[PDB]
Write a protein that binds this ligand. Structure first.
Ligand code: CL
Lengths: 214, 214
C-alpha cells in the first residue's frame, strides 16, 4: 500500500555544497516527491538530482516478495551508487534509511566531482531523464550489485550519458523468494518538473524477470 | 519471417587462433544456430562465444519497424562490440553481414585478450549465460550506441561479469519509426548446449520501450 516519504539530500558538486529537503508518498510501483533547496538555488541542473530524489516503491513479479520492504522489517539496507558521465563527471551517492510507522525517511549523501565547465549540467541544457532498465545480481555477503547505462535528453535532442553501478548492502539475507540463480531487471522512468529551487518528480519502478512478450 | 542463417567466427584469444562455421534459422523474435570448430577444439569455454554466434531476429513493438531488417534492404549496418570482464579479460568483436535471397551470412571477427589463467573461461566453470537488457540510443551520424551488463553463472552458483558496449553503424538513416527522442531496450536470453567442438543455441530477442506492466 501507500507510505509517507521524507528525504534530505546533502553534499557538494565540484566543491560547492547544497542541501534539499522534502518528501511525498509512494505505493507499489509509484512515488511522488517534492524537495526544495535550502539557502540558495542549485548551481547546476536539477535534473542531475532526480535519481538522488526509494527502491521500496517498485512493483514486483508474482512469486517474488519486495525485498526492500522485507528488509525494512529486518535490519534494512543501504545503497551506494556511482555515476560516471561521458565527459568525466562523477556522481557518488550513498542512501541510508530510517523507518517510522508508515513512513520511510531517506538520508542522501551526494558528492559530485570532475564535471567540466562545458558540461550540460552547467549549460543547463538537460530537458529530461530517459528511462532505464537495471540489471541486478545477488552476490555473496547479502549484496546486490546492479548496473545500467543512463541518458539525459538535451535541448537539441542529443543525449548526455552515464554508466551507473549500485551496491545494495543488506543487513540480513535477502528474501529467499528473490532467486539467486539469475538476475532480475528493474525498469524505471520519471516525470520531472524542476527549477533550481524546487524539484518535483513522479517515478515508476517495475521489477521483472522475463521478456515483456511471448 | 523464417530466414536461413550462415556464419563464420574467426579470431584469436590470448594469442591462439580459432575458427567456427555453421548456421541455422531465424524468425521475428527467435533464432537457432549451430557451429563447429575447424581443425581443433576450443582452448577456452564455448560459452564465451554465445554472443558471437544477428540483431535482425528481434521482435519489435507495434508501430516500430525492425530497423535491422530495414537496413538489410538499404545499405546494411555493421556492429562493433567490446566486452570488459571483471578480471581484465577483453573481448572485441566486429560483425559484418552479406545478404542473399532469404539468407543472412554473418562474418564475425573476434579478438580476445588480457584473460588471466585463473579466468573461468580457462577453468571451464561457466554453465550458462544469464539474460540481458540492452539500452539503445540513436545518435547523430546513423549510429546506435548500446550498453548493458552481462553475467555468466558458474558451477558454484556465483557469477562472472562483464560490462558491454556496442556501436551499430548504419550505412543509411535508421528507419524513422524508431523514435529518436529516447532509448529503446532489447531483452535477450539464450539456451545453450555446448562442447569445445560443437556449439548450439537458441536465442530470443525482444525490443520494447515501455514498462512490462501497467
Ligand atoms: Cl594459433
Amino acid at each position: 500500500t501507500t507510505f509517507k516519504i521524507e528525504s534530505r539530500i546533502h553534499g557538494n558538486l565540484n566543491g560547492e555544497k547544497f542541501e534539499l529537503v522534502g518528501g511525498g508518498v509512494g505505493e507499489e510501483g509509484r512515488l511522488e516527491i517534492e524537495m526544495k533547496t535550502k539557502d540558495k538555488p542549485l548551481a547546476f541542473s536539477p535534473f542531475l538530482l532526480s535519481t538522488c530524489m526509494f527502491y521500496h516503491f517498485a512493483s514486483f513479479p508474482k512469486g517474488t516478495k519486495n525485498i526492500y520492504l522485507h528488509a525494512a522489517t529486518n535490519g534494512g539496507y543501504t545503497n551506494t551508487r556511482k555515476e560516471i558521465y561521458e565527459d568525466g563527471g562523477i556522481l557518488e551517492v550513498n542512501f541510508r534509511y530510517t523507518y517510522e510507522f508508515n513512513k520511510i525517511i531517506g538520508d542522501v549523501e551526494c558528492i559530485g566531482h570532475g564535471f567540466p565547465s562545458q558540461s550540460p549540467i552547467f549549460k543547463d541544457t538537460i530537458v529530461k531523464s530517459c528511462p532505464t532498465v537495471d540489471l541486478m545480481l545477488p552476490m555473496s555477503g547479502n549484496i546486490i550489485a546492479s548496473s545500467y547505462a543512463r541518458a539525459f535528453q538535451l535541448k537539441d535532442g542529443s543525449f548526455y550519458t552515464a554508466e551507473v553501478k549500485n551496491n545494495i548492502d543488506f543487513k540480513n539475507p535477502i528474501h529467499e523468494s528473490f532467486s539467486k540463480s539469475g538476475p532480475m531487471f528493474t525498469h524505471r522512468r520519471v516525470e520531472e518538473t524542476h527549477t533550481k529551487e524546487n524539484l518535483a518528480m513522479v517515478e515508476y519502478q517495475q521489477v521483472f524477470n522475463s521478456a515483456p512478450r511471448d
